[PDB]
Ligand binder design. Structure first.
Ligand code: HEM
Ligand code: HEM
Lengths: 365, 364
């Protein structure tokens, strides 16, 4: 409908929120050594985010100013609706080496171990901070990231960015589950925005967890995963279904007639993705997945290049992504994918009201 | 609307309404066997019929023999036709194969080198193209991916470009879209409703000199990067002076409304609109059908974004060429760079359920 998603709250939007059709994800590095200047930026960014998420232009607007001045807003979202835009900020481990923050780095913001099979591009990994922009309109998402980058010129730079052309995740099990580029429904067994108890248990950090400023935030893992499309497209229908443990057309667990019927894991192959990723196979570890598909032109060698930009939110990286990904070491899916970029971020609690600002719990004041 | 008819005197995706998203692929041929290529064209035509109606190619994406790879890769299951159009074109380089050298249309002219060109050959050219336009990007991607799969062994993908325009579920269809410079883009263009203009400026006629192309058109593609960060540092007046229109309303200098006809004399001499207008080009007029693109961040931290420019015309020598030549002194040149280029002869339409892409070139 193009409606707005509320920006303020106990949590940042863009996590439990219904998954929007498009993604523009940007990782930034910090260039200023001046803590007071960074705080000033965080406040200016928050003010811009309030405008952008309501479908308004930043600052004084896109036109009507002094002819000799550059417009405050770049203008390409004029005439567009809010489009369910959310903007979610996160702080990477590397941020805590700056501004005297070292003693505030959360233990739950754990560096990932190395995993077998990966080929991580360092230039498109890491980052001192991130902004996840999600919207139903790609032009609204690009506009938001572009204007935040411009406001930040001189104090932060974009390290890397990723566009997602379509979602591969669901926080709304009452709606149709999207399909990834392997042709399978993706998001069936996730966490719903309406599952407040499971979000509290698996997603939101608590004060007793050890880092008071993170109370009401979450921890994000991003993995850019290339898909070996040519090899997958040669596989038989049975081979593809065996890889996942679900049938392709309906997406039901093996032996079942309906997508949402609960899996009987023992009937899956022992290396099936669902069998290895399920919480019951991981001592209860559960993720909020929120990823998107991507294309990246060609491989320069006659083939389309595409994949999945995987995003997982959890209350503690040590009890979420890390154990699950370790259990995927024998995943049959590994034959068809390769992880090629990675980053982790501590996503702070929400912007409480119009006087609050991104990062206020961490920076004080 | 939900779907666009695939059959016609013309191929759809030219004069038909502009869809929200693009997946454009250029292919190169990897077979020397003309009969095998004709067999592929027929197979691709059969697939396009299915795809443009929201159906899976071949026997489908599941339900077949378990030991067989499915005929369709499945990522459009549960989606809609989404106004998908699939438009095929033949590049100059195709005509060196299959004995077609004497059938290359004279109106399929190689573009000259233009001032400021910085073309990436890897993202230029192509023996063939398929333009997939749809409202849902996944429908467009699925079509391209499956056509490439069907063709693998006889064609490969040379380059691939995704693009976007308006989001029609939330943006009114009459509203002109804005490009990534923040200006309305498309105000003075040929419309699919202007049947006589299409005959004058877009469709090839038999007497033009290439009978098999009658009812086709010629396509120019230019991948045009914008220097986003420098543009955003320009003053409002500088930006408006570059185009000859105001930014907010998109009206010409000295007018009040977007669609008021321009008074070219009131624009700066090197304004884009003043140089591009048909009155500045001996009447030359284009059907522009391009899409914005954003491919991420370059190695310098700058937005890799711009316009994937597409123009259809009755003859490349009388459409794109004179107009682009007239843009040599464009004030816009400071903020843009042409980085990829290709031309294609887009054949006439698939006439009925027994016809096939390229039947007039290869013969029935
Ligand atoms: C290209 C890479 C991947 C693809 C194509 C993929 C695909 C799928 C599909 C088709 C399903 C079944 C439907 C669903 O319930 O969502 C699924 C489930 C799941 N995936 Fe993945 N996945 C990928 C990577 C990962 C990674 C990296 C992780 C975690 C480290 C992960 C964790 C999970 C979990 C936890 C489930 C739900 C299992 C359950 O509780 O039933 N997946 N995935
Ligand atoms: C990034 C590159 C470009 C941008 C941002 C751009 C933008 C614009 C804008 C804002 C307008 C005015 C609104 C309209 O009538 O559509 C316009 C008009 C036009 N442009 Fe472009 N343009 C670009 C490249 C080109 C190229 C490469 C050509 C042809 C070689 C071209 C040909 C035209 C024509 C024919 C018009 C209509 C002029 C008239 O008849 O009033 N443009 N363009």
């Amino acid at each position: 409908a193009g409606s707005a998603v509320p920006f303020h709250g106990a949590h940042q939007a863009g996590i439990a929120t219904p998954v929007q059709d498009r993604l523009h994800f940007a990782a930034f590095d910090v260039t200023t050594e001046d803590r007071a200047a960074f705080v000033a930026l965080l406040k200016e960014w928050t003010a811009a985010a309030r405008r952008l998420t309501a479908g308004h232009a930043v600052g004084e607007g896109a036109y009507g100013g002094l002819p000799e001045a550059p417009p405050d807003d770049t203008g390409e979202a004029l005439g567009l609706k809010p489009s369910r835009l959310t903007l979610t900020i996160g702080f990477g481990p590397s941020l805590f080496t700056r501004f005297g923050l070292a003693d505030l780095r959360p233990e739950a913001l754990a560096d990932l171990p190395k995993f077998p099979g990966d080929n991580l591009d360092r230039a498109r990994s890491g980052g001192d901070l991130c902004v996840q922009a999600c919207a139903d309109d790609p032009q609204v998402a690009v506009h938001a990231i572009r204007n935040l980058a411009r406001i930040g010129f001189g104090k932060v730079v974009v390290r890397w960015s990723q566009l997602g052309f379509g979602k591969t995740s669901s926080t709304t099990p009452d709606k149709q589950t999207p399909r990834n580029l392997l042709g399978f429904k993706d998001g069936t067994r996730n966490i719903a925005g309406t599952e407040k108890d499971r979000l509290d248990r698996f997603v939101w950090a608590a004060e007793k967890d050890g880092t008071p400023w993170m109370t009401g935030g979450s921890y994000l893992v991003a993995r850019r995963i290339r898909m070996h499309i040519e090899t997958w497209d040669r596989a038989s229908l049975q081979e593809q279904e065996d890889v996942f443990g679900r049938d392709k057309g309906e997406g039901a667990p093996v032996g079942k007639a309906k997508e949402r019927d609960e899996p009987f894991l023992k009937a899956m192959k022992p290396d099936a993705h669902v069998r290895l990723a399920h919480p019951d196979s991981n001592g209860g570890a559960t993720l909020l997945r929120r990823g998107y598909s991507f294309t990246d032109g060609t491989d320069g060698l006659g083939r389309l290049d595409a994949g999945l930009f995987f995003l997982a939110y959890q209350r503690d990286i040590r009890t979420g992504f890390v154990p699950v990904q370790r259990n995927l070491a024998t995943d049959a899916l590994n034959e068809f994918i390769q992880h090629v970029g990675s980053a982790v971020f501590a996503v702070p609690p929400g912007v409480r009201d119009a006087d609050d600002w991104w990062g206020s719990t961490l920076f004080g004041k």
